[PDB]
Amino acid sequence: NLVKRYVAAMIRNSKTHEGLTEENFKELKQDISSFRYEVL
Amino acid sequence: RIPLQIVRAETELSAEEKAFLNAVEKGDYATVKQALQEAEIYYNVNINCMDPLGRSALLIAIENENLEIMELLLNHSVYVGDALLYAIRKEVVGAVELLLSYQFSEFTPDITPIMLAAHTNNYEIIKLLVQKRVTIPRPHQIRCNCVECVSSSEVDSLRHSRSRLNIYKALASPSLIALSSEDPILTAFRLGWELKELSKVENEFKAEYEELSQQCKLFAKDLLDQARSSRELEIILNHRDDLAKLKVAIKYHQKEFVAQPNCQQLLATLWYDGFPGWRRKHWVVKLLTCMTIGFLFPMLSIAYLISPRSNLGLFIKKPFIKFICHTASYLTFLFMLLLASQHIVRTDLHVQGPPPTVVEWMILPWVLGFIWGEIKEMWDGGFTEYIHDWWNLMDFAMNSLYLATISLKIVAYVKYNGSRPREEWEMWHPTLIAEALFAISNILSSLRLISLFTANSHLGPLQISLGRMLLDILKFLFIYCLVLLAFANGLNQLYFYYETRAIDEPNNCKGIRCEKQNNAFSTLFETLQSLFWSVFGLLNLYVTNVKARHEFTEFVGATMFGTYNVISLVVLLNMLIAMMNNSYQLIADHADIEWKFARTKLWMSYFDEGGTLPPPFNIIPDSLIQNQHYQEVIRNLVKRYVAAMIRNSKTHEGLTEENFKELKQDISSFRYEVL
Amino acid sequence: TANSHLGPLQISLGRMLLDILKFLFIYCLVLLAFANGLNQLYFYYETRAIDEPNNCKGIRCEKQNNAFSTLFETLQSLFWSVFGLLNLYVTNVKARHEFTEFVGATMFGTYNVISLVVLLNMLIAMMNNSYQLIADHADIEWKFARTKLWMSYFDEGGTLPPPFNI
Amino acid sequence: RIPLQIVRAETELSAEEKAFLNAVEKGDYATVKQALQEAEIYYNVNINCMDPLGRSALLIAIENENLEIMELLLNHSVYVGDALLYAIRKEVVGAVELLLSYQFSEFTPDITPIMLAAHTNNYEIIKLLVQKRVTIPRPHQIRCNCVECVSSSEVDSLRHSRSRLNIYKALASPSLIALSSEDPILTAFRLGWELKELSKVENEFKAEYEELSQQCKLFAKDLLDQARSSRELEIILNHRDDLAKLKVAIKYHQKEFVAQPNCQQLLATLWYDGFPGWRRKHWVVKLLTCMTIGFLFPMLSIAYLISPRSNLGLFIKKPFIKFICHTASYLTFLFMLLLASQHIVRTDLHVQGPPPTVVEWMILPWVLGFIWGEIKEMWDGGFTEYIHDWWNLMDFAMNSLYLATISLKIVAYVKYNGSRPREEWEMWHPTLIAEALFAISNILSSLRLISLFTANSHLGPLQISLGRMLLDILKFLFIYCLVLLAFANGLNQLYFYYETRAIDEPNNCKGIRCEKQNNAFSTLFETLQSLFWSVFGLLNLYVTNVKARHEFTEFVGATMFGTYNVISLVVLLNMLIAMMNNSYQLIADHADIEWKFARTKLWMSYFDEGGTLPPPFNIIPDSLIQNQHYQEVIRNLVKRYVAAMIRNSKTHEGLTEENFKELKQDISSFRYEVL
Amino acid sequence: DLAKLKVAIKYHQKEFVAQPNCQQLLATLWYDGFPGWRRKHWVVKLL
Ligand SMILES: CC(C)CCC[C@@H](C)[C@H]1CC[C@H]2[C@@H]3CC=C4C[C@@H](OC(=O)CCC(=O)O)CC[C@]4(C)[C@H]3CC[C@]12C
Ligand SMILES: CC(C)CCC[C@@H](C)[C@H]1CC[C@H]2[C@@H]3CC=C4C[C@@H](OC(=O)CCC(=O)O)CC[C@]4(C)[C@H]3CC[C@]12C
Ligand SMILES: CC(C)CCC[C@@H](C)[C@H]1CC[C@H]2[C@@H]3CC=C4C[C@@H](OC(=O)CCC(=O)O)CC[C@]4(C)[C@H]3CC[C@]12C
Ligand SMILES: [Ca+2]
Ligand SMILES: [Ca+2]
Ligand SMILES: [Zn+2]
Ligand SMILES: [Zn+2]
């Protein structure tokens, strides 16, 4: 139980503005490329 | 070769649940729908499937802030417990509104949604929750012997402490005070006082309670900071449940509230009542005016007695002139105390019981005035706060020594008739005790002037730091007294066998207060005196030498003396230097708020009518309208504060996340329009 | 360590005694150097206890005699000069050797300068810096020491006080 | 009523130029093209139009990082001067490559594109520029009397200083050293040394030159930090243009390079040559082994003389055993110096010229060994660095006092025959001067042991801080000596009229070194002595009292004495406390690199063959392959460093800007594909 | 009894020992005969 609680707290304390921002740009680029391929 | 395997194996779900969880995480209106239909028909997918890292389908849908998948999962009877708390902590309005419209957990079971909303300090979520008729359990009083507290602490102490801290953290949020309390200033004052007094009780969770108390004090100061007019500030400070709320804030030790610049402006205008623009004038003319008003201290007090409501009778009723007159009277008292020990007024020094001189006859009305003022201070104002001053102990010591001196003078006058030269008086003659106690009281009375340093702008923080470092002097004297007792015991035990008599020693002197210091360690009292005086270098080295040729005993005594000197100077004095330097460095940050609080407390002591006369002359014989005005002022202040706080909550991170969410939603909508 | 106010104080006392121990090495080296020099200069003018008044030979007399005559007495004199308990006339000899007296007084003054003005204020700076560093982690150390004191009374061994444990 | 108008009116362009500038800023392939065509035909638009806030069309096109508009403006003959610098400072590769493929300015006219590229420290742009055959002007030597420097400094000093600082900032960039220099370590060492020596010359621009020197030292340390093997580190440290590059780094005061952990590993393995795993053993067995090798100091030195290349002859050639033997010999010398002042070996104290005793006869070979070693140190190794030690002044003082003692003993032996009691010798007898100088040299020799503190791990930084605070003792004694001279002059001038004689004073004593202190301020020398001794409290208060009843003179003298005591203790000593506390606080950060540099410098003094014998016994009578290996090592180290630096240059801001640029370009391309 | 606490004391784990809940458990084991010793006044505690 203690290890599960600690790993959950640590794993979202690892969420950072930089990593979230990079993830959002990657998702936006992938979705825009998929939409462009659907149109083309 | 260290083998590495997962020792705590987690029961992984089937591959059919992985597809459902991936469809929930990626976001698909059709794949999740057909997966739920197949779960309903063929029972292929458990709807309440949960990730090993504490993430159910509803939690992931909350993390993606998409309301369509959340609505479909809510309509598909997904386990909804412990899911509103995640949306509250994530601080999104739409998901909280939707879940309010209807195993492992990251939250302790004592957390309610309103408590987590108050912990997160989001105004919109707290307002939306408190609209739904929510309540917070009342924390108990600090000292409980009741069954409901004692049994709960005995069964589960950690849960009890966590629940109390969580409740007090929920109650201390500025948004909950601004919404749920009709008097946010008094609520913040009271909560800050309870949290400060509870930090000392629960000494292990001291930092969190101190932080919450500081948060409440900051909220009260920031609520006062939004005043745009002097009328609003006067309504705030005069609100009675003259300056009532300021006195309440002084009672609750709200130093940040008191030292606010507009409060200090109002106090300064009330202080310089008869001087419009005292800070405008030159320092020379200010000193001249102060000197004139001080030198007019026989005046403006007889005029108050003969005509209280005349042109001149109201002059001393102003606070600054009252302070100047009191200071002038005390300085005149100290001047007569200085004059009392002069040859011009003191003659015939060989009488056992003397009548009082003219200077002591003039001193006596001042002493009676001080005694009567301290007696009146016990009754008027109250007794439970008279001892809560730490300056009244000094005044009590002065008045007790004055009374002892007067009584001893009376006894020595009534039982000793005649004359006798001073050398053949006894050791405990009442006259000698009277002269000793008078001198001690003179020292105390002249040292009483330190309390006036808070009025000045340069000597106030200096006295604040003096108190700060005397608090560590008090800690240092314990170690020093233990070391002194140890070495005094050892040196007296070694040296008491070689005690001599006063007759054998030259000049009939036995002690360390002679020209040739004798019997420094013969008795325990003299050993303590010698080891005290050796700190200042006033104890010579030959006091460790005995008459006989016992060189080993002399060497051991000199070694004890050297070890004591090393310990008590080289270690301890420089340790005290380091301690007081560190304490001064810490207090130098918060050194002007403390001085302004002390100066305010000194100023309000001269505002009232009680004690207008100086101690020389003090022995001569509708509420609804105010409540509604305060309510409008509080409404305006709370609205201004919540607007300032709500856009000060705008942050680059949150704005950036909002812009990505809006861009993703708009791109998805445009793609759906094209497709 | 049991008390809440004198515990971290004793922790800091140990922290700064750890630097007292470093400082006494330099001080003892300086003391040995100046003791060697002063004894070498002054040992030729050693007197006897009979010739000196009150049959006293040493610095623990009313008139301090033979302060630098022997190495042990030179060490004692240079130790006691830190607290100002060594008078200035101990550098004066019976004969009219003013150059020897001047060189001895110059050694005494140089030792006083080195051992007080440089070294004591250096020790002040060292202990102030060490106190400033330890003042951050001063409550965890006290709680560890208080815990170690508490677990020493938990066991059954040593229940009786030392009057009654025999 | 303060009127507000623009006092510095800027000539605004016509409305036709605003359309062109807005079309350039917004980005349009067609509007800018037709605007340029209309400017060519109808002359409606000035092509070289410039914004009031220093922004031409080409500069805005650079700021938008779009190459199509830049290419069209380049083909349309837009003024291209002072535009490559903006693209270099913006750090975009494409615009710099395009402008390299062919009024008001924000850059000073002495800045070249390569200089700005080196200032920005971008590896790709610097490489692309240096491929185009670019050069940097060579800065002159620091001390120039030539016409080209003196005339330029006289005509325009600010431009000259700015140009020199810009050139030295361009030369100090790590990328330019990594590309243009074949020996980046030696180049970084040399540039750091010149910048450090030039910061003291140009004392006004000291911070920038110190920062550049620190940057060069950091680059050298970081280039050494990329070594992945001991062979590479040994190739780096042994490269000669044994440890040659380490000696060069010690010469250039590269403390960060020297105190690198792998360099310290290699030095520690070279230091414990005969002890594999000295740090592994217990401290007790280490102390026992050190004590045994130290006590064997007559041994291992005779064996070196009789058989240098035997099993035992090579034992002292190891550095640690050599250090232990030298320390043991010095401690034995100090032990004999202690024994020289004892009654067991010193008798017959009433002879004018004595023959030397057995202890002094044993002392003499040690003194001759020290003198011969210091003489050899002047010749061997060099003379220009012998004075650059600050410990050789102490050794010179010791040897001069030893020579003076020996010569005075010889003179007193050859010219004084017979015996005479010590009280009737003269003031300046050569024997007495010999005994005084021997004692002073004993003090110096015993205080010489402080130099061994850098070997120990606990007393090294302590001695470093001791030097740090002696540097401020030296500053404090100037003010103290000025105050001492002032008060000595005043007190002697006041008190010299009441000078007595030695006969009139008791015990025929005239001075402050008596039982009753007499004539404390009679002479200037005695006044200086009295005012010095009053600091330690050894001057009594009655020395300010004169024989006559001149109470005004005595009061003025006592007031001068009290003012001197206040100034010299209460102000000055606590000022010195504050100064040394501040200096210790600053040096406590960089206190371990200094100690490691000093310990390294002590270690390399025992590596060489010179001075192997202790002072008791030292008077008894192809380069191409190495260059190519170093070149491969430098190639690998520079590649590793540039990779680590080039992705350590990746930043959230730059990555975010790159992602927006890529997203905008892809969205525009998709829109053009749809349209 | 407290075995892991003794192990942490042996390994000089000062942060583990000075944790607030460990200090609560140690304080309840220390004031065995005084339920609420910190609750009382300092005068009655001294008496
Ligand atoms: C240095 C020696 C000569 C001092 C002797 C004792 C007294 C003559 C001094 C000591 C403390 C002094 C007091 C310190 C502080 C103040 C407050 C000061 O208040 C103001 O300036 C008024 C405006 C305000 O309240 O801010 C007026 C002078 C006064 C009473 C001073 C009057 C003179 C006092 C009593
Ligand atoms: C200043 C002079 C008079 C001191 C003379 C020596 C003794 C009388 C003193 C010195 C140290 C004192 C002790 C310092 C610390 C403590 C721990 C303190 O512990 C508590 O408060 C109990 C709760 C807890 O363990 O936290 C109880 C008093 C006691 C034993 C003190 C008792 C009185 C002592 C032995
Ligand atoms: C406190 C009193 C008794 C000191 C008397 C003087 C000497 C006996 C002391 C003073 C300085 C001491 C030295 C200080 C530092 C060192 C370096 C130290 O070096 C090491 O530990 C070897 C490994 C390394 O080089 O790091 C060996 C002892 C030694 C020579 C010490 C030997 C003993 C010395 C000479
Ligand atoms: Ca009072
Ligand atoms: Ca040398
Ligand atoms: Zn309760
Ligand atoms: Zn030149």
**Considering only CB atoms, which chain C residues are within 8 Å of D340?**
40
**Considering only CB atoms, which chain E residues are within 8 Å of C148?**
9
Q: Both tokens of residue B336?
A: 């007569």
Give every CB contact of residue D203 below 8 A, 6+ residues apart in sequence.
none
Distance from the Cα of residue B595 to its chain's centroid = 13
CA–CA distances in Å: residue D568 to residues C105, D473, D531: 21, 14, 10
Q: Count other C-beta atoms under 10 Å from residue B322's C-beta.
A: 21
| 3-state secondary structure (DSSP) of residue C137 | coil
Query: How far apart are the C-alpha atoms of B411 and B409, rounded to whole Å?
Result: 6
Q: State the chains in contact with B (3 or more Cβ–Cβ pairs under 8 Å).
A: A, C, E
Q: Contact D527/C119 with Cβ under 8 angstroms?
A: no
Query: How far apart are the C-alpha atoms of B607 and B246, rounded to whole Å?
Result: 13
| 3-state secondary structure (DSSP) of residue D419 | strand
Q: Where are the alpha helices (DSSP H) in D425-548?
A: 430-447, 460-495, 524-533
Residue B555 class from Cβ within 10 Å (0-12 exposed, 13-18 middle, 19+ buried)?
A: middle
**Considering only CB atoms, which chain D residues are within 8 Å of A25?**
656, 659, 663
DSSP letters spanning D31-72? HHHHHHHHHHHT--S-TT-B-TTS-BHHHHHHHTT-HHHHHH
Amino acid letter, residue B38:
E
Nearest by CB to E21, from B143, B150, B158: name it. Answer: B158
B6 touches chain A (CB under 8 A): no
CA–CA distances in Å: residue D19 to residues B56, B190, C87, D79, D267: 57, 65, 96, 19, 71
Give every CB contact of residue C27 below 8 A, 6+ residues apart in sequence.
C115, C119
For chain E, the maximum distance between any two Cα atoms, rounded to a whole number of angstroms, is 39
Q: What is chain A's percent helix, strand, coil content, to nearest 5?
A: 90, 0, 10
Going by the DSSP 8-state scheme, the letter that residue C45 receives in this structure is G
Q: Both tokens of residue D517?
A: 């202190």
The residues with which B351 forms a beta bridge, in sequence order, are B419
Query: How far apart are the C-alpha atoms of D360 and D405, rounded to whole Å?
Result: 11
DSSP letters spanning D71-84? HHHHHTT---TT-H
Phi, psi angle pair for C92, to nearest 5°: -100, 130
Residue B330: closest CA among B395, B376, B385: B395
Distance D317 CA to ligand 3 centre (A): 21
Residue C43: closest CA among B555, D419, D423, D349: D349
Distance D105 CA to ligand 7 centre (A): 29
Q: Contact C110/D440 with Cβ under 8 angstroms?
A: no
Going by the DSSP 8-state scheme, the letter that residue D418 receives in this structure is S
Q: Both tokens of residue B154?
A: 């005995």
Residue D216: closest CA among D275, D157, D168: D168
Q: Compute the residue count for chain E.
A: 47
> Structure resolution in Å?
3.2
E23 touches chain B (CB under 8 A): yes
CA–CA distances in Å: residue C97 to residues B134, B157, C140, D530: 100, 83, 63, 20
B326 labeled binding residue:
no
Q: Count other C-beta atoms under 10 Å from residue E31's C-beta.
A: 12
Query: How far apart are the C-alpha atoms of D360 and C46, rounded to whole Å?
Result: 21
Q: Contact B27/B66 with Cβ under 8 angstroms?
A: yes
Query: How far apart are the C-alpha atoms of B654 and D566, rounded to whole Å?
Result: 62
Going by the DSSP 8-state scheme, the letter that residue C67 receives in this structure is T
Give every CB contact of residue D552 below 8 A, 6+ residues apart in sequence.
none
Query: How far apart are the C-alpha atoms of B2 and D357, rounded to whole Å?
Result: 72
Q: What is chain E's percent helix, strand, coil content, to nearest 5?
A: 60, 0, 40
Residue C90: closest CA among D512, D403, B547, B476: D512
Sign of CA pseudo-dihedral D311, D317, D321, D325: positive
C26 touches chain B (CB under 8 A): no
Interchain pair A21, B53: CB under 8 A: no
Residue D525: closest CA among D476, D557, D488: D488
Crossing angle of the two packed helices B157-171 and B113-120, in degrees rounded to 10: 60
Query: How far apart are the C-alpha atoms of D521 and D490, rounded to whole Å?
Result: 10
The residues with which B56 forms a beta bridge, in sequence order, are B50
The residues with which D56 forms a beta bridge, in sequence order, are D50
Query: How far apart are the C-alpha atoms of C18 and C130, rounded to whole Å?
Result: 10
Amino acid letter, residue E21:
N
DSSP letters spanning D623-666? HHHHHHHHHHHHHHHHHHHHHHHHHHT--HHHHHHHHHHHHHHH
Buried b (16+ CB within 10 A) or exposed e, B335-364: eebeebeeeeeeeeeebbbbeeeebbebbe
Query: How far apart are the C-alpha atoms of B50 and B56, rounded to whole Å?
Result: 4
| Rg value, chain D, Cα | 38
Residue with tokens 């006062």: B224
Residue D189: closest CA among D250, D260, D136, D267: D250
Q: What atom of ligand 3 comes closest to residue D327's alpha carbon? A: 30
Q: Both tokens of residue B406?
A: 């007067």
Distance B374 CA to ligand 4 centre (A): 6
Q: Contact D329/D301 with Cβ under 8 angstroms?
A: no
HEC secondary structure over B262-330: HHHHHHHHHHCCCCCCCCCCCHHHHHHHHHHHHHCCCCCCHHHHHCCCCCCCCCCCCHHHHHHHHHHHH
Buried b (16+ CB within 10 A) or exposed e, B109-134: eebbbbbbbbbebbbebbeebbeeee
Helices and strands (DSSP H and E) totals, chain D = 30, 0
Residue with tokens 């002697």: D492
Mutating to test ligand 3, I would choose from D327, D334, D596, D607 the residue with most ligand atoms within 8 A of its C-beta, which is D327
Going by the DSSP 8-state scheme, the letter that residue B351 receives in this structure is B
Technique employed here was: cryo-EM
CA–CA distances in Å: residue D120 to residues B558, D89, D169, E37: 71, 6, 10, 67
With a 6 Å cutoff on the Cβ, whether B291 touches ligand 1 is: no
The residues with which D50 forms a beta bridge, in sequence order, are D56
Residue B106: closest CA among B82, B80, B79, B81: B82
Interchain pair E14, C139: CB under 8 A: no
**Considering only CB atoms, which chain B residues are within 8 Å of C76?**
558
| 3-state secondary structure (DSSP) of residue B108 | coil
Query: How far apart are the C-alpha atoms of B149 and B147, rounded to whole Å?
Result: 6
Distance from the Cα of residue D508 to its chain's centroid = 56
Q: Contact C108/C77 with Cβ under 8 angstroms?
A: no
Q: Contact B421/B350 with Cβ under 8 angstroms?
A: yes
Phi, psi angle pair for B56, to nearest 5°: -80, 180
| 3-state secondary structure (DSSP) of residue D161 | helix
Query: How far apart are the C-alpha atoms of C8 and B594, rounded to whole Å?
Result: 26
Q: Where are the alpha helices (DSSP H) in B297-427?
A: 302-306, 319-339, 358-379, 392-415
A30 touches chain B (CB under 8 A): no
Q: Both tokens of residue B462?
A: 């200096």
Residue B409: closest CA among B351, B448, B362: B351
Pocket of ligand 3 (CB under 6 A): C 25, 28-29, 32; D 327, 331, 449, 452-453, 455-456, 459
Query: How far apart are the C-alpha atoms of D594 and D600, rounded to whole Å?
Result: 10
Residue B129: closest CA among B119, B118, B137: B118
Distance D167 CA to ligand 7 centre (A): 14
Residue with tokens 């194996």: B9
DSSP letters spanning B120-136? HT-HHHHHHHHTT----
